[PDB]
Structure formats: structure tokens, C-alpha cells
Design a protein around this nucleic acid. Sequence first.
RNA 1: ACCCACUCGGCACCUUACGAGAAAUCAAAGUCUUUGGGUUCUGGGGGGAGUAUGGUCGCAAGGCUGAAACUUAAAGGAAUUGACGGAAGGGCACCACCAGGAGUGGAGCCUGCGGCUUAAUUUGACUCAACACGGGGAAACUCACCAGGUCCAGACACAAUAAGGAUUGACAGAUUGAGAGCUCUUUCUUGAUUUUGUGGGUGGUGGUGCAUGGCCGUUCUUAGUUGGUGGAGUGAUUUGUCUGCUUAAUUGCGAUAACGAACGAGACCUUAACCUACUAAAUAGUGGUGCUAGCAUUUGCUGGUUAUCCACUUCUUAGAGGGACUAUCGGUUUCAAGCCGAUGGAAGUUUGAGGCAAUAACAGGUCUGUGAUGCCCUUAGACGUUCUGGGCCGCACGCGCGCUACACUGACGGAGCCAGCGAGUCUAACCUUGGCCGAGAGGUCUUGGUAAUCUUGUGAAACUCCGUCGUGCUGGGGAUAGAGCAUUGUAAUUAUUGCUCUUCAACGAGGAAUUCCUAGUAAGCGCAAGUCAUCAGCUUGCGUUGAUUACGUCCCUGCCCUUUGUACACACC
Lengths: 71, 64
Amino acid sequence: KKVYTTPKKIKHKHKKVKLAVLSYYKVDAEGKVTKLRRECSNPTCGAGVFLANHKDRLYCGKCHSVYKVNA
Amino acid sequence: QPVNDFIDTATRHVLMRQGVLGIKVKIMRDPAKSRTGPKALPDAVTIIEPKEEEPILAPSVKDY
RNA sequence: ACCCACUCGGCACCUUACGAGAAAUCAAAGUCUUUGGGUUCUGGGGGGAGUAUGGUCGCAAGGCUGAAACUUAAAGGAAUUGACGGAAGGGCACCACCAGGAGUGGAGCCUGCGGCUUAAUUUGACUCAACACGGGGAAACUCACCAGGUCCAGACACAAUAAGGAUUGACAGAUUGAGAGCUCUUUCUUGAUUUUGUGGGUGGUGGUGCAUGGCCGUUCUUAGUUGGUGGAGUGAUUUGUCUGCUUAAUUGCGAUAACGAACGAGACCUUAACCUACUAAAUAGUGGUGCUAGCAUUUGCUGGUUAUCCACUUCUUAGAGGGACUAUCGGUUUCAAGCCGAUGGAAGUUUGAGGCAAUAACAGGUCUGUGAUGCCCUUAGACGUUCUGGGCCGCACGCGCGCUACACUGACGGAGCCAGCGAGUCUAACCUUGGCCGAGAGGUCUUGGUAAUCUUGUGAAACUCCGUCGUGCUGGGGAUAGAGCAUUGUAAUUAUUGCUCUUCAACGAGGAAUUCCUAGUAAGCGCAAGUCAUCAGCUUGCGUUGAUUACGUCCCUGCCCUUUGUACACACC
Ligand SMILES: [Mg+2]
Ligand SMILES: [Mg+2]
Ligand SMILES: [Mg+2]
Ligand SMILES: [Mg+2]
Ligand SMILES: [Mg+2]
Ligand SMILES: [Mg+2]
Ligand SMILES: [Mg+2]
Ligand SMILES: [Mg+2]
Ligand SMILES: [Mg+2]
Ligand SMILES: [Mg+2]
Ligand SMILES: [Mg+2]
Ligand SMILES: [Mg+2]
Ligand SMILES: [Mg+2]
Ligand SMILES: [Mg+2]
Ligand SMILES: [Mg+2]
Ligand SMILES: [Mg+2]
Ligand SMILES: [Mg+2]
Ligand SMILES: [Mg+2]
Ligand SMILES: [Mg+2]
Ligand SMILES: [Mg+2]
Ligand SMILES: [Mg+2]
Ligand SMILES: [Mg+2]
Ligand SMILES: [Mg+2]
Ligand SMILES: [Mg+2]
Ligand SMILES: [Mg+2]
Ligand SMILES: [Mg+2]
Ligand SMILES: [Zn+2]
């Protein structure tokens, strides 16, 4: 046939990060808990799921993409 | 046509290790028993065997 | 000199074989395991090799005598069956000629193949038996090729990471051809489905058709293949299965150490021809009758009316039968199979045309039809797959099949106006009548049909008639090209197709060569079907119009058959 070509630079993939994560949750001196990052008004995502903080932009990750709830 | 009538055929492909070989079977059934079709080859020409007779005998006639 | 009979001794031939032999053959090659008349000479697997050496003869060239080491499983004989020949004798055939027809070869274009060009211009196939073939008419698809972009649809097993999260997704932006979270920024989400590794799988229009199956094509427009009982032979084998004649045919007659059979040919089956005989039909049609139009009128002639009624089956349809067997007669013949002529017949070339089709062969073609397949290759920056765009169409040129023409047996315009084989829409947009609108292509509104019911009498084309043009590249011819409309489609640019105006080429019958064909055939003519969203200059069938010339031969070419040679048998590659 031929085999091999390329101008170099093969594409990587996706790492999907790490994070020890669920810290966003402040709870006082025994023991009142107040959430951080506001949750999702879309009744298909029962308010456990949170919106991410970008610029403008609060975004429902669980709504796999859906809905731009922004304040 | 008797082909259509009388011979059954079949090819099967037996798949082995070194390669794959083919079987071809061809049975032909006795037309004398056909149960439902021609009972012989289109070739068959049976002649019926004549009876030996004792002729002669001057006339005569029998009443009933 | 000749003729006849016998007899010695010669050169040979014939026929047999008691007999001999591995046979071919042999009056000796006989009288040999039932082995002895006398005597001479030579051989003891094949090469090495008639070589080395010594002797001897010769002017020489060379003669006579004449080893070994080493190597090797065969070399050799006669006969059989094959296969093959550049021999010989017969045949058979419009993929052969004869006698002719219509042509291709010249031209414009269509289309395949080469070549060249190219990012790529995917690939198979190259004498008949590659080149309008792969059903191959590729705009996406197809698709295999090229420029790029995603995805895993990487089974299962072990191991690792790992609920403090193995892994999955994403809006916007950036990015990108792109409203691909491809990748990146950012930071939510998902929860044991993955991810990493090794092993093992898996797909692949990747290779290999010279590893295979299956299918196909070719030999083959051919006529060959085998067994029982008998004959010959130690045997493989042979004869039967053959000089001739005959046939499309190993089809038969006949000849005959053969007799009588089976496969293949024939038979058989399918289709086209004949049935006023049989069984029927509002999904086929006729006559009568009503209801009714037109012209005549003297009753007539010509139409209308999916059931206003009666009757029939000629025409149409398809079931069951019947028919033909080359019949009768006459020629010719080994008075045999047959062949020829006449009469009759729907039919008398295997009735015409097909389907089927023994044994065997080929390194024919096909892994690019297959979830048929061995082995090889590759498998995540893929040769998996999909998505975007290009390409198979590219153009100094060589080859093949084709279409259209070079006009007056015509072109054009009006007018007559006649087929057959087909096909059509359910979970759908197929075949389309009629009415409108449109110069046209087309549009629009309705409609019949899952169909002998509707499209469709498919009112098809050549062809027929009355005109116009008048031999001038002419009004023959219609390539090339401009401009506009419209249809299929997501898409039409490299112009899918269709219409219109214009533009108006080559080609004045074609060198050497070469193809096809014998009666409803050749040729001319269009149609339906396959392909198909759209596209036929292709194919498969079909009907329409309808000839000239053979009814022969072996000259060319191709094949088959005997005979014959062989040291070939992996069989002349
Ligand atoms: Mg050996
Ligand atoms: Mg000629
Ligand atoms: Mg000619
Ligand atoms: Mg593509
Ligand atoms: Mg793995
Ligand atoms: Mg591996
Ligand atoms: Mg495959
Ligand atoms: Mg082959
Ligand atoms: Mg094969
Ligand atoms: Mg090859
Ligand atoms: Mg012929
Ligand atoms: Mg014997
Ligand atoms: Mg013979
Ligand atoms: Mg009838
Ligand atoms: Mg006659
Ligand atoms: Mg080959
Ligand atoms: Mg195949
Ligand atoms: Mg092509
Ligand atoms: Mg061809
Ligand atoms: Mg208009
Ligand atoms: Mg309807
Ligand atoms: Mg002109
Ligand atoms: Mg013209
Ligand atoms: Mg068509
Ligand atoms: Mg084609
Ligand atoms: Mg021989
Ligand atoms: Zn949400």
C-alpha cells in the first residue's frame, strides 16, 4: 500500500479532571448547613443538582446541556 | 423433465480447518412407486404378453 | 524354347501352430523344472569408461589387450491406454467459404479499454472464450480512490485504578467545512454500565481465484461414456464401440466373435401454430330486444346506452381431450436405414423456437454477491465505520461495441391511422384518464386501478395519402456554442433530463481489412421491461413492414475422427 504520512501533532482525548469535589456546602458551628452554587428549577432535575459559575452564565450540568438560568 | 420428476439433489458446504469443501448428493427414487405423477420414465414401453390360444374346432354354437 | 508329374540342392514368400517367448514375433527363437547330440565364443545392475595404466602393432591417425577408486535406485526391454506432432486419410459448420443481403472499417457524437494527466483520476478482465462485460446508465449514497473531520459498535477472561468516585455528558466561547464539547477555556453533571494493561476476540470492496466452496464460461453449433454374457490376451487391455451407407446425432441400416442393454442424443418439458368438437364467462365478446341520435326514408345505413331484458361461445380467455406418424402415392437407393418430388394437411427444415443436458478437462473468471471460506495482512493517528468536499467524466493520441447521416425509394408540413410482450400505491404516494392554464416543456383540480375491471384499443414507429422544396453541403446533416424557461433531487457548477430561439461543423457511400445472417429469416421500424429520485445512444423481450441469394462444397479458417511416431504421462507451457 503506502503506510505513514502526517505533519505531526496527534490529537489527545479527554481527561475528565479529578477534584475531591463536594466541598460546596457550608455548615456552621453545629451544624446548620447552607448550600453554595444555586440548584436547578427544572422539575426533571430535582434541586440536588447545582449550576456552575461561569461569567454571566449559570449552567445546569445535569440538564446535560439544557437551560440557561442566569442571575 | 424426468429430472424435475425423479432426482433429488443437494449441495452443502462443510467448513473445516485447512479449508472448506463441498458435498453434492443426488438420490433418484424408483418411478414405479411415484404415488402421484408418472409411474415410469418417458422411455418405458411395456408390451403385453399375448395369450397362447387353441384355435381350430369346426364352427358350433351354444344356447342360453 | 514351352507344358505337366516327381526328385535333390539354392535365394525367399505364404498359411498355420503341435510348440516357444516378457512380449513384438519365431520352421527355429521348436523338440528345456518331463531341465544332457558335439563343440567354439561372450554377458552378469547403472554410471565411472572402452576411461587410467602396462604390453603390443602402426609413418600417423589409431587397432588389440584393458582396470580401479568413487558414485548411484534404478538404467533397460516388449506391449497397453492416454496426451501431443510442424505426418497421412476421411469429415462437420454462415461464431467456414460458395451465392448474396445488410453493414462495421472513413465522418460527428455516445460508450467501454489503453495511454497520458492527476490529490485521486478505485478495481477486475486482454485471441475466439477482456474492451454497452462485472447486470458497471457513479452528481450525495453507491465507493473500493483522494484532501480532511468524528466514533468503537475493541465480545469475553485476568490484572490495575476506584465510591474520598472507575467513568459518562455538556451550554457559551474559542475552535472548525460545520449548530462535532474534535480539542481548549470555565465547572457543573453522571455512578461502576466504563478507563489503562495483557491475553483473546472482532470488523475489513485489505492480499491471495496459484490455498478453497459455490456459481459461471470454454472445449461443445459437440457425440461421446459404461456394464452383463461371449471371443482374443500371462497381463495392462481389447472386441462389442466397425470398411461402407445413412442421420442434426455411437441417428440408424448394414458388415460382423459378437449377442443383447444402460448414461448422454432421442424421448421428456415449455412456448408459437390447428379445433363452429367438450366445460363456461357483467373482469372477454357476438346476435336480438327495448331506451335513443344522425342521414335517408320503402323496410334501410351509422352510432349512443358496466346490467332495461333474452339467447349464444364464431372471434377473447384456459381447463380436459383430439391432431402428425415425415401420411398416401410416386421416384432413387446395396429397392436397406434413408433421401427427393407431387397430393392432401393447421402444421411435413428435429413442425418452427427454446428449457433440460453424460464422462472428462482449464491453475478460464469470481475472495468486489454472500454472516461461504483457509492462511496472510490490519485493527484506534484503523486498511473498522461514518460525516464534509473532490474523484471514477479528467484529454496531444491508439483500439472495440454503438447511435446518427451523407438525401428525391428523400426532408419538411398537413391528413390517414394499425401491434405485441409488459408494469403499476399499505401502512402509501406507484401506473394515471378526464377538466382547465400554458407556444412548449410543464402546472393545477379532480379521478379509475392492488388491475383481462382503470391507465390502455397503450390511436407506437416505420408505413399510407395531398401538398412544399428541386439537386444546389440544399429546406440533406445536426456536431459545436450563446441566451431563456421548466422538472427530479437536500444538492444539478465540471453544464442529470426536458422545451425555445439562435449558432449550422464533419460527413458527397468510405484504403488495407473485417462482422452477421437462409423465411415471417435479413434488414428497416418503434414499444415494454431491467436499471431508475432524476438519466438509454445499453440490454432482455415484443410486435409492426418485409426482401435478394444457397438448399452447395472442403478453397480459406475452426473443430472432430481414424491411421501413424514418441525417449512425453506434472503429458509440448
Ligand atoms: Mg529416490
Ligand atoms: Mg461472400
Ligand atoms: Mg463491404
Ligand atoms: Mg463520501
Ligand atoms: Mg484490548
Ligand atoms: Mg493484541
Ligand atoms: Mg468481507
Ligand atoms: Mg481458477
Ligand atoms: Mg472456482
Ligand atoms: Mg489477480
Ligand atoms: Mg448454424
Ligand atoms: Mg480368459
Ligand atoms: Mg473406438
Ligand atoms: Mg371457441
Ligand atoms: Mg400444398
Ligand atoms: Mg490464472
Ligand atoms: Mg464468490
Ligand atoms: Mg467507469
Ligand atoms: Mg461484447
Ligand atoms: Mg407563457
Ligand atoms: Mg381510491
Ligand atoms: Mg444547410
Ligand atoms: Mg434537418
Ligand atoms: Mg426505461
Ligand atoms: Mg449496462
Ligand atoms: Mg502407442
Ligand atoms: Zn437542570
